[PDB]
Symmetry: C3
Subunit: 219 residues, 3 copies
């Protein structure tokens, strides 16, 4: 059931918050404190999201099905900080950070429209959102990777691992969406919740630990 | 169904036993033989547990629901050896080993009471068990980590990885418990089985391979 | 439902194809192009398989249950290339490649018979197929590992990781089979699909990324 996974989510993120929060405190230097604090805020925003969803908030019947539009509201706050985990580690220039957050915000706003609009109009917005996502796929794979690798020549595998894990994780969201009742409806309203909660935990708690491991490698 | 996962469990642990048992035999030295044998015994105890549960043993109706109390009986034997995987690798002093096994045994006995007592009395014992667990969280994170790192200065990341994977894995057991019919009952009696079988396989077969990889790093 | 997982499979492999195909193009040298192309073909064969299964092809009622015999048809093409990922990396001699592909082909043909024959005759063919699989377990663990380690003395952990991940992944297929309606029928026709789709994705997309990481280590 959706409630069990929303609750699984509530505890997962809150426990991710405590872990990073304890790392934020007793941190070695500024570089380490920032990274631990970025991941602390990400998991706090997510714990907040899951707490509201589990208590029946942020949901409404849209086109005959329960829709947790609150996901867009909070994803709009955590995802720029997830992209900040990458740019902070890469020591990326601000114009490239601007582009990433730019294309990220675009993706969520048009992604939100596809979620609240009926069929077949929703497919247009899905396509537009996927294109904003494919713009992000290019930026991380080419300008971001080339700049981070020149700035860290002995750690080309760290950013290679960062980007690939970021690509696998973020690509499964439009896959879940188009297979859920929003698209082709291959599975129920309960599976959508489960898939999103496992994806969210991995994309924030899981990625959190990866970026810290990535910093250990850089030294 | 619970039966499919109990059977998934039976084969998983038995195959973990063969793998470590074959490693126990044809081992390089004493340090390697011990580690392979520790993990061999852990998986044997677990294969035994799952074999009894699958055949309908160690279960009884407690407060109106099937309860596999046999989990506590066998967890009481495998978990001290899981903690021995850490202390053997860290080359930890005996007083610290005493403390860990001490607090581990406490956690399972009070954890067992919470499992067999009705609501709301069960919540008291859950809280006490969680406190015995939080005592373990401190011991691994602070005295254990500081001693293992001084004894191995070039492998601070090995014990860092050991402890974190040990923390993530062991924390999900009280989460499963409090969400199952024992606590807030967010999910069925079938999901509890599934979650525990995936957790057990990871905490013994999965952790088994991690500790061997941790020894490879130490050389 | 089976349809949701078959569709999950269709997109997973197709996205694995694009990733490796883009790696195949813009590759550093011949050693890198070959590896990226091997994994590109593997995922293409798998995307093809899942596309046919999702559209209702390659299935027929055998002994009173839907049976996707098409799995054997395509597994017969992808698995020799999965074994080629190992031998290409190990720089293995052709007689050992011959033996592996030999025993692999045997396993699938007798494995296919067990799938299409009734009970209890099916158990004989299962046993024969498992023995062809245990012949593969020996070849990878002993002749393959000893040759790859002499040819790469500073990367004994790369092939150690290759083989173990290959063993864990490939062993779960006869476990799924014997627990499914083909054997002891512990779970439904829907769980069999799900388990096979998660196993296939890991054994091709997952293993694909591992073998590339293994090449990075070799340099
Ligand atoms: C913790 C939450 C994260 C990392 C959210 C990720 C969401 C996306 C990458 C957006 C995916 C979508 C498309 C690209 C197509 C339209 C439908 C969406 C919004 C699910
Ligand atoms: C292979 C089995 C393992 C590693 C068992 C782990 C079990 C625990 C860490 C105990 C968890 C519990 C609490 C701390 C609260 C009360 C309920 C328990 C017994 C599930
Ligand atoms: C991508 C597909 C892969 C890697 C297929 C793997 C299949 C096997 C290793 C075969 C397993 C079987 C036995 C050894 C016993 C009989 C039943 C089978 C065919 C499931
Ligand atoms: C939801 C839970 C909210 C997060 C709670 C605490 C974050 C951890 C803060 C730890 C600071 C304590 C001082 C210390 O490190 O000794
Ligand atoms: C039924 C009543 C609901 C239970 C009440 C509170 C849930 C406790 C979880 C709170 C953890 C803090 C995470 C957060 O910051 O949102
Ligand atoms: C229906 C109410 C929806 C609330 C508005 C959601 C904003 C999220 C967004 O930025 O797209
Ligand atoms: C809510 C999430 C916070 C939103 C936006 C933060 C983006 C700021 C990016 C600026 C780069 C950091 C810097 O100035 O050093
Ligand atoms: C939001 C606005 C961002 C505008 C800055 C974009 C600069 C492009 C340079 C680049 O990303 O390579
Ligand atoms: C830097 C980029 C910032 C993001 C800008 C997003 C661009 C928005 C453009 C089109 C979205 C349409 C407006 C959403 C209204 C939908 C109405 C509804 O709720 O159904
Ligand atoms: C700042 C950009 C946010 C634009 C999204 C607004 C659409 C949500 C709504 O319909 O109220
Ligand atoms: C009965 C309904 C049949 C189901 C049809 C499902 C076929 C899948 C079709 C389209 C999948 C969408 C493509 C995945 C999004 C890619 C976006 C990206 O990351 O670039
Ligand atoms: C040292 C860092 C490695 C240790 C632990 C990282 C694992 C984090 C566990 C969350 C996994 C996310 C998921 O798939 O559910
Ligand atoms: C911590 C250092 C280890 C870095 C290696 C990371 C490799 C694992 C990465 C991705 C695999 C996880 C993808 C599967 C997500 C599960 C959620 C879902 O799809 O439902
Ligand atoms: C349940 C299965 C019980 C475990 C069985 C065997 C453990 C492996 C022992 C291998 C020793 C054989 C001698 C050798 O290594 O050549
Ligand atoms: C129905 C009959 C039950 C099937 C009988 C035995 C199961 C075989 C598994 C035995 C593996 C040994 C693992 C162990 O040591 O417990
Ligand atoms: C009811 C019978 C329970 C058997 C006793 C379980 C002992 C496990 C424990 O040490 O807590
Ligand atoms: C059943 C599990 C076995 C129980 C307890 C073993 C604990 C012994 C710890 C002593 C440290 C090892 C040593 O003496 O070198
Ligand atoms: C059981 C009894 C254990 C008693 C020994 C505990 C010594 C405390 C020293 C320490 O763990 O830091
Ligand atoms: C070194 C620590 C060893 C472990 C000691 C555990 C302490 C036991 C204290 C209290 C538990 C209560 C006794 C259990 C009886 C419960 C009765 C029942 O089965 O319902
Ligand atoms: C309808 C019932 C609502 C469900 C309420 C669920 C709220 C979750 C509340 C408490 C979770 C327990 C905290 C997790 C245990 C932490 C123990 C530890 O590792 O330190
Ligand atoms: C070399 C060591 C790494 C290789 C394999 C470790 C993977 C063990 C597979 C068990 C995973 C546990 C699980 O999550 O089900
Ligand atoms: C073998 C060396 C690799 C070491 C890195 C290990 C990182 C992965 C660790 C933990 C992630 C797994 C946690 C999820 C457990 C699944 C069981 C469940 O929660 O139901
Ligand atoms: C199903 C999808 C089929 C696979 C499609 C494309 C593989 C990628 C080929 C990329 C070559 C483009 C040239 C380039 O690298 O710039
Ligand atoms: C209902 C109609 C079915 C949908 C049609 C096509 C599915 C699109 C997926 C095609 C991706 C190419 C992968 C492949 O090579 O097989
Ligand atoms: C019934 C039709 C089966 C088609 C033949 C399958 C061949 C696969 C194999 O090589 O075993
Ligand atoms: C369809 C899968 C292709 C089948 C068989 C390819 C096996 C060829 C093995 C020969 C070794 C490669 C070589 O000649 O260098
Ligand atoms: C198919 C035929 C393969 C015959 C070649 C086998 C040579 C055996 C040598 C070896 O693998 O160690
Ligand atoms: C190099 C090894 C090549 C593989 C050879 C496989 C050996 C085949 C031997 C016996 C399998 C029996 C023939 C299959 C017919 C089954 C009839 C049916 O479809 O039900
Ligand atoms: C009601 C039915 C009871 C279910 C009985 C299940 C017992 C499991 C029995 C046999 C499992 C088969 C052994 C696993 C295959 C090993 C092949 C290999 O990798 O070597
Ligand atoms: C750099 C290479 C490591 C990065 C990513 C590998 C993870 C691949 C994700 C597929 C996991 C397969 C699965 O279990 O579903
Ligand atoms: C990419 C480099 C990392 C290498 C370490 C790999 C360790 C993980 C390996 C195996 C664990 C996955 C096994 C579980 C398969 C899930 C599918 C299923 O059983 O249903
Ligand atoms: Br969020
Ligand atoms: Br560097
Ligand atoms: Br156990
Ligand atoms: Br060291
Ligand atoms: Br295939
Ligand atoms: Br080497």
């Amino acid at each position: 059931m959706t409630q069990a996974w929303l609750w699984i989510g509530v505890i997962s993120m809150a426990l991710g918050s405590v872990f990073f929060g304890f790392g934020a405190h007793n941190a070695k230097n500024e570089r380490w404190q920032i990274l631990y604090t970025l991941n602390f805020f990400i998991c706090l925003i997510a714990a907040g999201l899951y707490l509201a969803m589990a208590l029946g908030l942020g949901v409404n019947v849209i086109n005959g099905r329960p829709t947790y539009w609150v996901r867009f509201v909070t994803w709009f706050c955590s995802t720029p900080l997830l992209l900040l985990d990458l740019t902070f580690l890469g020591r990326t220039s601000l114009p490239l950070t601007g582009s990433l957050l730019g294309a990220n915000a675009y993706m969520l706003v048009t992604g939100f429209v596809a979620t609240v609009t009926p069929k077949p109009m929703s497919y247009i917005w899905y396509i537009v959102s996927c294109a904003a996502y494919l713009a992000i796929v290019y930026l991380l794979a080419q300008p971001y990777r080339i700049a981070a690798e020149r700035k860290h020549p002995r750690s080309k595998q760290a950013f290679r691992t960062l980007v690939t894990v970021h690509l696998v994780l973020w690509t499964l969201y439009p896959i879940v969406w188009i297979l859920s009742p929003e698209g082709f409806s291959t599975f129920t309203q309960g599976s959508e919740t489960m898939f999103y909660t496992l994806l969210d935990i991995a994309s924030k708690v899981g990625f959190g630990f990866l970026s810290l491991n990535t910093l250990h490698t850089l030294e």
